[PDB]
């Protein structure tokens, strides 16, 4: 659908937003916890992607409540965004099979 | 659809390509960073799959920008490829339920 392709692009954008929110907020939330690793924006941003794709290589994670609260948002966003894309591929194909026969 | 099955196979191929790009490039990008582990093609290729399926056992990861930039591409490819397959299963079933009633 024109809707499904719109929704897909929009998710992509929002994800990038969240990732960027993700890093700023992660750093902002973990500075003050001794032993926190998640305390510079560029590594917060690496951390944000591997969280959002649910790769979790485990090089980096939050140790504080708001670290983990943020991380949850980022996870959820990520998983949503990629699902919507898959749905938007599903709708395109279904559409193209509909007309195929009628 | 004939389209959805075409698209599925094509993703499969591209993924294999990316995996292979993935390894060559990972090795090419991490040799020169002391302590990098991701510096031989065969282990770059193990690394490339667990990244692309988002298993991340965490035995292996990149430590450099282009390591991580490459890794992102590989993630994204992986997640896309398997989504398209699921979509291409969704279209097949929808099609087979359509005719079932009409």
């Amino acid at each position: 659908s024109a809707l499904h392709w719109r929704a897909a692009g929009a998710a992509t954008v929002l994800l990038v937003i969240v990732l960027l929110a993700g890093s700023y907020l992660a750093v902002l939330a973990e500075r003050g916890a001794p032993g926190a690793q998640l305390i510079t924006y560029p590594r917060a941003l690496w951390w944000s992607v591997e969280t959002a794709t649910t790769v979790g290589y485990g090089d980096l994670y939050p140790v504080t409540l708001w670290g983990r609260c943020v991380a949850v948002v980022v996870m959820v966003a990520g998983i949503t965004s990629f699902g919507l894309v898959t749905a938007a591929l599903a709708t395109w194909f279904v559409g193209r099979e509909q007309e195929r026969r009628g | 659809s004939a389209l959805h099955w075409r698209a599925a196979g094509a993703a499969t191929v591209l993924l294999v390509i990316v995996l292979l790009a993935g390894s060559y490039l990972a090795v090419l990008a991490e040799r020169g960073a002391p302590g990098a582990q991701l510096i031989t093609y065969p282990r770059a290729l193990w690394w490339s799959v667990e990244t692309a399926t988002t298993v991340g056992y965490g035995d292996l990861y990149p430590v450099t920008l282009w390591g991580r930039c490459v890794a992102v591409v590989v993630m994204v490819a992986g997640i896309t490829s398997f989504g398209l397959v699921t979509a291409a299963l969704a279209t097949w079933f929808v099609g087979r339920e359509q005719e079932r009633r009409g």
Partner: antibody
Amino acid sequence: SEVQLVESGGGLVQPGGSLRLSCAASGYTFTSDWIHWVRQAPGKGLEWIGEIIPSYGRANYADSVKGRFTISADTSKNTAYLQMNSLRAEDTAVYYCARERGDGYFDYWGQGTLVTVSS
Amino acid sequence: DIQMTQSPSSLSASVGDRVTITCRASQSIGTDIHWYQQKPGKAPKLLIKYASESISGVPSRFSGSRSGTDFTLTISSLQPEDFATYYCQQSNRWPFTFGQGTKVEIKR
């Protein structure tokens, strides 16, 4: 240099007294920048002491500084401050403020000011 | 808290000579070390970032290197101007901490 951090405040304080130091921007500063405070007791190393993002205005501190000291910021003036209470002789040192972009290093520092603690 | 430990704690090399300053991290910190030069009475000046990355305006005699827990600032050809105390500093783990300092006296 450019984005010169100027420092204000600094002098003699009574053991247990209060002194408000100051750090002014005087340059282009991203909204996300942290201002840090860094100590050097006479003939000794540098000691990290505290950070603030002037914008969200949340501040963190080293154990040595505890809740004796409070870091504040006036975003209207582009002037971040350090409020010192409890002052021991330990606290006798030069205090440098310094800018960090959130990467984890200090590109521009302040001229530094002595705080001397003596009855 | 991550202990940066510099080496030696002071140096007198002849000008033109090759001088190296070790700084051992107490745990792996990646490459999140940065070197500063402090001339007597002045504010510290950043020399190297991220282990090797060089700063705009710093001379070429200054190079940071090394991995493992070990990190090394090298002044290729010691100058008279290089009379300073040099500090390493970690960004790996909160809070940021500094090394004890290494003081370079010129010999002549």
